[PDB]
Amino acid sequence: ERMGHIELASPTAHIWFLKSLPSRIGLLLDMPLRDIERVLYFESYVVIE
């Protein structure tokens, strides 16, 4: 009945709310899923502001 927690250094993305189509992150940010996957795979930078 007792859970623990791991304190992740870099905050990672949930795979359910990213890969279960429709992706909900591409549907919220209005970005293509391939471009979001390129950002998450550390292949290409994205600009915030």
Binding site: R38, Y41, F42, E43, S44
Partner: protein, 84 residues
């Protein structure tokens, strides 16, 4: 290019393919630059007076016989008189 790749070690081998191998002579120059940076950081921390008083008082702490002779000196009856 940055296609549909999913193996992270393949992307690691792509991101490490941008650099080049080292020749016979170049790593001696890189190690000389490393030692030049170490010599620069040592020669800039040399002339700070409170750091000099810190090393003398740590020598008073090791000469008061409660700390070991290994956690503050590595090398170069001799260190005692030169610190005196």
């Amino acid at each position: 290019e940055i296609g549909r790749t999913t193996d992270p070690v393949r992307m690691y081998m792509r991101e490490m393919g941008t650099v080049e191998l080292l020749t016979r002579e170049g790593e001696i120059d890189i190690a000389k630059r490393i030692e030049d940076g170490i010599n620069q950081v040592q020669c800039s921390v040399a002339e700070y007076p409170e750091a000099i008083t810190y090393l003398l008082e740590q020598y008073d702490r090791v000469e008061a016989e409660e700390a070991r002779l290994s956690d503050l000196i590595t090398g170069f009856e001799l260190a005692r008189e030169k610190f005196a």
